[PDB]
Each structure stands twice: as C-alpha cells, then as structure tokens.
Amino acid sequence: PSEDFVVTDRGGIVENSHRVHAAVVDAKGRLLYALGNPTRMTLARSAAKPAQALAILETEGVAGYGFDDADIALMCASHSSEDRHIARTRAMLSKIKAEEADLRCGGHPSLSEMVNRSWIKQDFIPTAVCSNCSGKHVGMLAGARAIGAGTDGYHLPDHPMQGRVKRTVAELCDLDAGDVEWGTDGCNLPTPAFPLDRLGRIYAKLASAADGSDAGEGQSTRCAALAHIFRAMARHPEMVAGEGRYCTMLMRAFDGALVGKLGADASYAIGVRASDATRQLGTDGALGISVKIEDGNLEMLYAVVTELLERLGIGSPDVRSQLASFHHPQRVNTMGVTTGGVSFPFKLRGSKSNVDDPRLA
Amino acid sequence: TPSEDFVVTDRGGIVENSHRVHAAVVDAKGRLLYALGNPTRMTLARSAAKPAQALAILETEGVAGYGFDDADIALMCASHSSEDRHIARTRAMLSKIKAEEADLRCGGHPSLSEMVNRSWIKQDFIPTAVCSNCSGKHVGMLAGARAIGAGTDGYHLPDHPMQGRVKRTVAELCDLDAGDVEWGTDGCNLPTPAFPLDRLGRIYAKLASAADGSDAGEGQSTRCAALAHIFRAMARHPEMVAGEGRYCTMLMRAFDGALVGKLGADASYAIGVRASDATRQLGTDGALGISVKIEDGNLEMLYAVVTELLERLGIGSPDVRSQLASFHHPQRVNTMGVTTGGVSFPFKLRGSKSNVDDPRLA
Ligand SMILES: [Zn+2]
Ligand SMILES: [Zn+2]
Numbered sequence: 001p002s003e004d005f006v007v008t009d010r011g012g013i014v015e016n017s018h019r020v021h022a023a024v025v026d027a028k029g030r031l032l033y034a035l036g037n038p039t040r041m042t043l044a045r046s047a048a049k050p051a052q053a054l055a056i057l058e059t060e061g062v063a064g065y066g067f068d069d070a071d072i073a074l075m076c077a078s079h080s081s082e083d084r085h086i087a088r089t090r091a092m093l094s095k096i097k098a099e100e101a102d103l104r105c106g107g108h109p110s111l112s113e114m115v116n117r118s119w120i121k122q123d124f125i126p127t128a129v130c131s132n133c134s135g136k137h138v139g140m141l142a143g144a145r146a147i148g149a150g151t152d153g154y155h156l157p158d159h160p161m162q163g164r165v166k167r168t169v170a171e172l173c174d175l176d177a178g179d180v181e182w183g184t185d186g187c188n189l190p191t192p193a194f195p196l197d198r199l200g201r202i203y204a205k206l207a208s209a210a211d212g213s214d215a216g217e218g219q220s221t222r223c224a225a226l227a228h229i230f231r232a233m234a235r236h237p238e239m240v241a242g243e244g245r246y247c248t249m250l251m252r253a254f255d256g257a258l259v260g261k262l263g264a265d266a267s268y269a270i271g272v273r274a275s276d277a278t279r280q281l282g283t284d285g286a287l288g289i290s291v292k293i294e295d296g297n298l299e300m301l302y303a304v305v306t307e308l309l310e311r312l313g314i315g316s317p318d319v320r321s322q323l324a325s326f327h328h329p330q331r332v333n334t335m336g337v338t339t340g341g342v343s344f345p346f347k348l349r350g351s352k353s354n355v356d357d358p359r360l361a
Numbered sequence: 362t363p364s365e366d367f368v369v370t371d372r373g374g375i376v377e378n379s380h381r382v383h384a385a386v387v388d389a390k391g392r393l394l395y396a397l398g399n400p401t402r403m404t405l406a407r408s409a410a411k412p413a414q415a416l417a418i419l420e421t422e423g424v425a426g427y428g429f430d431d432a433d434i435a436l437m438c439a440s441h442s443s444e445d446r447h448i449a450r451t452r453a454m455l456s457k458i459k460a461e462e463a464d465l466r467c468g469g470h471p472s473l474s475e476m477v478n479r480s481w482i483k484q485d486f487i488p489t490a491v492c493s494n495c496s497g498k499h500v501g502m503l504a505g506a507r508a509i510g511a512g513t514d515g516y517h518l519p520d521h522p523m524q525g526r527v528k529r530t531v532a533e534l535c536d537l538d539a540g541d542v543e544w545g546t547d548g549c550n551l552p553t554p555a556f557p558l559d560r561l562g563r564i565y566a567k568l569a570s571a572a573d574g575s576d577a578g579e580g581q582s583t584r585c586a587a588l589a590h591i592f593r594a595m596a597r598h599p600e601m602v603a604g605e606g607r608y609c610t611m612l613m614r615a616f617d618g619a620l621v622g623k624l625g626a627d628a629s630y631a632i633g634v635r636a637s638d639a640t641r642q643l644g645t646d647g648a649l650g651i652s653v654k655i656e657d658g659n660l661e662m663l664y665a666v667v668t669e670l671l672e673r674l675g676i677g678s679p680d681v682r683s684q685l686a687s688f689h690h691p692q693r694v695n696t697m698g699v700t701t702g703g704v705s706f707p708f709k710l711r712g713s714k715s716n717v718d719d720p721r722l723a
Contacts, residue, residue: 008627008658010405011545013555015627016658019381043372106696120482131696183373188697193375265370265377295657296370296378334468334493335550 001037004346006293006300006307008331010339019294020304020346021196024312027208027285029174029201033312033348033361035291039195042292045185046078047263048169048192049136050229051202055168056139057225059161061146065095067139072229073236074135078262080112080242081130088239089129092138096145103128104155105137105187112242133187135239140165140189157182157190166190172205173198186264196290199269204288206230206259207271211286230271233259246302246326253322254315266293266301270309277314282353300342302326307344311360363399366708368655368662368669370693372701381656382666382708383558386674389570389647391536391563395674395710395722397653401557404654407547407625408440410531410554411498412591413564417530418501419587421523423508427457429501434591435598436497440624442474442604443492450601451496458504465490466517467499467549474604495549497601502527502551519544519552527552534567535560548626558629558652565633566650568592568621573636573648592633595621608664608688615684616677628655628663632671639676644715662704664688669706675721 004022008015021036031038053075056062067075071092079085093099107126110116119126131137137155144154144161153159157166169192170180185191206226212219213227233240237251240261250260250270260270270289272278278287289308293301306327310320320327331340350361363383370377383398393400415437418424429437433454441447455461469488472478481488493499499517506516506523515521519528531554532542547553568588574581575589595602599613602623612622612632622632634640634649643649651670655663668689672682682689693702710722 010547010553010555011543013405013543013545014403015405016656018657041376043375043377104697106698108696117482120479181373181375183375184695184699184701185372186695186701188695188699191372193372294378295380295659295662297657297659300657333546333548333550334470335466336468337546337550339546339548 002035002347002349004035006304007343007345009341009343010331012340015340018297018300021292021294022304022308023197023200023288023290024281025197025200025204025288026283027204029197029204029288030351031197032281032283032287032351032354035346035348036294038197040292041181041193042196042199042267043183043191043193043263043265044199044267044269045191045263045265046133047199047261047267047269047290049076049078049261050206050233051169051172052136052165053139053229054172054222054225055161055165056143057228058168058222059143059146059164062142064146065142067092067095067142069232070236070239071095071135072232073239075139076229076233076261077135077240078111078132078247078264079135079239080115080245081110081126081132082112082115082242085134085239085242086129089134089138092135096138096142098138098141098145098151100127100129102141102151103131103134103137105131105133105189107131108186112244114244131187133185133189136189137187155189162190166192169194172202174201196292199267200288200290202288203259203261203269203271203290204286205271207273207286207288211274230259233261246305246323249322249326253319257315260305265296266298267291268301268305270305272314277312280313299329303329303342304344311348364397364709364711366397368666369705369707371703371705372693377702380659380662383654383656384666384670385559385562385650385652386643387559387562387566387650388645389566391559391566391650392713393559394643394645394649394713394716397708397710398656400559402654403543403555404558404561404629405545405553405555405625405627406561406629406631407553407627408495409561409623409625409629409631409652411438411440411623412568412595413531413534414498414527415501415591416534416584416587417523417527418505419590420530420584421505421508421526424504426508427504429454429457429504431594432598432601433457433497434594435601437501438591438595438623439497439602440473440494440609440626441497441601442477442607443472443488443494444474444477444604447496447601447604448491451491451500454497454500455491458500458507460500460503460507460513462489462491464503464513465493465496465499467493467495467551469493470548474606476605493549495547495551498551499549517551524552528554534564536563558654561629561631562650562652564650565621565631565652566648567633569633569635569648569650592621595623608685611684611688615681619677622667624660624663627658628660629653630663630667632667634676639674642675661691665691665704666706673710673721
C-alpha cells in the first residue's frame, strides 16, 4: 500500500499530515483506483446505514407502515438533530405506534454547531429522539414489530432484527459472516467492520440499482429496494444530514447523479450512477467510492472526498464549487489573515487498464 | 529511518483510528535519550514556544519596571481557557503598562474550554482580543515594545524590534542558526517558529535545569535566572497557563513543582523535568526535556501519549499520575453508557545506545 497523505501547512511549513485510504470500484466491486490500503478493515459506522435500511425494508409487512421517501432518507441519516429531524422521527414512531420510550439510542451533542448553540441557549438536554441515528432506530423497531419478535431489545445483536442486519451487510459486501466483524456504535446498535473496498461495493450496488430501476429494467426485489433507498437519499438529502452538512450539499449539488454518506471517525461512501464521467473512468456501469482518513479527522475527510471527485472528473467544476469550503478548508487566523492551507500530494494508483494515464492515475 | 509508532483506538477490539507519534526525550544538553517516530521532525512549536517568547519579553531592558508578578508571567506562558480570571488578569496587565485592549493585535476565538464556550454561547458573548488564549503573551510583547521605545504600533510584525528579539531568543534557546528556524504566522497573529522537535525538548530541559541551578543557589547568568523564574511562574500558577480541567493545569498541579508542561496547537507538547530519582533512573544526572507531536494533530491522543510516556519513563508516582487518568485512557462510552472500546499504546520507546534493551522500554 502507498504513502498517500493530505497535508496542512502554516506558511509552507508542514503542520499536520493525514493518511488516506480509498477504493474506487465498479458495480461488481472490481478495484479501478486506490489510495493507501483500499482493503483496510474499516468500521463503516453510519456509512453502513443504507445496508441497515435494506434489512428494514426487506422485512415482511414494513411496507404496511406507510414510510415515505423522506422517512427512508432519515433511516439512512446521520442527521443534525434539527427540529424537522426530531419531528420526522416522532411521525415515524406514530406510524408504527411506538413511543420515544421504546428507543434504545441516547442523546448527544448535535453534529451541527448551530443546533448545539440553539440547544445551549434553551438549556435543552438531547434525548433518544434527538439521536443522529433516530431514523435507523425507528426503522429497526418497525422491523422488530413486523417480524413478530417484539420490540424489546430490538438493538441487541441476538434480536432477530439484528440477525437480518448482519446477514444483509455480509451479502451486500459479498462476504462470509466470518469476514464481517461487529462492535457497538455510539447509538448502541451493532456496527460492522469490513474491507474498505466493500463499502465502495455497497454504494456501487445502490447506484447500479438506481440505473436498473430508471431503465425500466426488471429487478430482483432486493435491487428494487436498493433503487428506492438511492432515490430516497438523493431526493431528500436534508433528511440524510442537514443544513450546511457535506452530505446534504454534495447530494443537492449533484441533483440525483450520486448519493454520499458519512461514517463517524472519517469514513465516506459515494454511489455514482452511470454517466459520461464513469465511462471515462473505464467502466460502463455505476461506480462506488469509499474513503477512510486513518486518524479520524472529518475536516480532512471532506477535503479529500471532494479532491477525489475533482481528480476523477465526477461532476463539473461548477457543480463541485458548491463544496469549495469543504474542498479547501480555510486557514484564517483570529485577525482574518490566511496562515496556510491544505494540499493533496497523494497520487491515485490504477488498475491495469488505468495504469499510466497521465491524468494522475 | 524513523519508527512506525502509533497510538491506536478500537471499537470492540476492531481498529478505529491510528495516530503516528513523534517524541524526543533529551538531557539538559539536548542529547537524545529516548525517541518515538522522528525525534527531529521539523515541527511548528505553536504555543509550546511560549516560555521562549516570555524569555525575550523578560530580558527586554526595563520590563522589570512594570511589576509583572508570577501569575502574570504564567499568563504570558499560557494557552488559557479565556475564564473571567484570565480576561481580568489580561486587563490588569494592560493596566500595568497603561495600554488599552485596542492596542492588542490578537483576535477573539471560541474558548479552548467547552464550559466557557457554553457560557458565552448562552449570553451571545462575541469574544474580543482580550479573550485570546495568547492575550498574556501579547500584553508581554506590547510591554517589551514599549520598553524598547520601538513603540507598541506593529509590535506583532516580524520586522518589529520586539519580534527580532523573539526570533534571536528562540534560535539561541534551540542552539540553532537563525536559518534552521522557520517562521509562519500563528492564530493570534504573531510570528511562530518551526524547528526540529528535539529542540523543543531542549528548551524545556533548559527551563528545568535553570530551576535546579536556581534552587541549588548556584551562580547563574541573567538568562538562567530568567528561565528559572519562567519555570517557577508556570509550575506555581498552572491555572493561568491553561485553566479548569485543562491537561497542563492538572499535570502541573499533580507534580507540585517537579515539572512544567505546555501544549502547542495541532498537538505538540513539551515538558521540562527537574533532576529527580526518576530522571536519575533514566540515565541522566541533570534535568530532562520531553517533546511530543501527534502527526495528525489530535489533542485527545496527545494527552493520552504524553501521560503514557510519563508512565513508561517512571516520572512521578502512580498516585501523582492517577490525577491524569481521564486523559491517559480516553473514555469510549456510547450514548447509553456502554463502553465500546478504548485506546492502546503499541508504540515502543527507542533508546540511545546506553538505554538499548532495557526491558522497561516496553
Ligand atoms: Zn447509529
Ligand atoms: Zn499565540
């Protein structure tokens, strides 16, 4: 594996450096481009959420609860805990006739500084319904009810809802159960680790499913549901994150061409629908991108992800300029003097078919 | 060829994040005794340079005249939390030199303390210059500029005579030629130096050595007396150097005068340790300096590694170091109070030749 870094400087003097791992894969998970170790065993954290939403959506009779595309986007969310997110979470609890008291996720400081500031003013202590993963938890309760397993312990790994989740994640990764490791997340659910490239493969399968559905092609019920999750995230991107959040601004910029999702401690996944851009990357289908910053730095993650989209020619300069504040983190001191910047000396490595493209592959 | 030395975090035994560690442990002459990573890494010292800047201030002819006390000198050496007491002391220091807040050329920022920020956020308080974590250093630089007769205007600019004194003093404490120290601009809008990481340790060894010389009642150069004075001000006013719940403050209170420690932004740290049974056991007959950089800049990981280093080096009793356990072993507890993982130190100290294969390295 290569020595691929994002580097910060102060007056040209190196401040911090951050090791970058990245996989770019086709609809079958074949590796097209890489940084660092693209097979790094990686906790996907919230970037696993679409796989968890598929498990929920494949549960007999969850159709019955009348979840809309905005609700599915919230199941797929690390939301900012804005009032709209809390209100959708409550409306989802009503649709399954459950109560806040059924939630086994806990409250935390908002992922949005402006939300935190609102909460600090109101001396508000966040509760379970405020969890960035609240949507997932309501989705898991819904699954738990529909299975007839009861909602008690729906979060526990031996609950049948979690056995559906583990099985679904392994299958989307094309891995044996033994190849997927499990810990416990901040929101108190089981959370998977698998090779970084397989997160890319999950998202390439979402984008691939969207293309199959749109092409009015016949589709397995699994593929139909993946198309539905893609559409839900792309068309309700504020539900997936919130105002000023990377994921939201990324998916609004791309206006349905891709979905993207943060994982805590600096993983990211994108599924890109077949396009002129993906064709020039030497695949005729959809594409998956997965990234991990080794040290967990989110600011560096969003810079690297945006740089990779630019390097890969995904969207136009004009679409990607909506993310300029993320691409090029500001280094402006307390007196408004620019003191340095962020550089990307990493160099994409290519599959054999991409080797020696001077477009730095 | 520098070692692959990491602090590693896990979730259920599964690697989450890893952070590359650089560290130097040096004697009073700056000779390297132990290392992690690249002990000579060119490193922006940021706020860890503050004792050297304070020396430039205290060696300025006539600064004595203003009657700065030890708590004031600690504030010069501070990255404070912008507690009311730090803002009050900054105003008292401006009073001693008859300057106004408007003369400061640092800007306000969100407090280094979450509790202070929450207080400010609640009162929609916009922090101003006097609130800067570097406010004490800036008042000291203004004081130096005034006493030079250069005048306070442009005191912060690299070509101002006060910054000339700073740049010379930093290179001198490092035992480096001027061209071996690089300069950028800090968050507080002052020049800020970069030099090999071991020279940060060397500065802190010299602070502690000076303190030893002073307390031994040995004859000392005016510079060594000034270094001793800085050591004493930091060790005896540790709340002024940082604040409530801050690593630097808790570390220096725990050690009760045996060492000083100081953060630099983007996760550098420096400690100067007075000659002790511990330093003797480490194979040196004088004071010791420790300098650390976390390559990716993570402060939580810096405090964990620094504390782990003091433990591996036997500096302090386990009881003294236990005051820092919350920093040493960062908690990994989820929103429902379940422990989900922790932090490991699989890095391994490398020794000078006289320290090779001491099994206490691990
Ligand atoms: Zn979660
Ligand atoms: Zn400063």
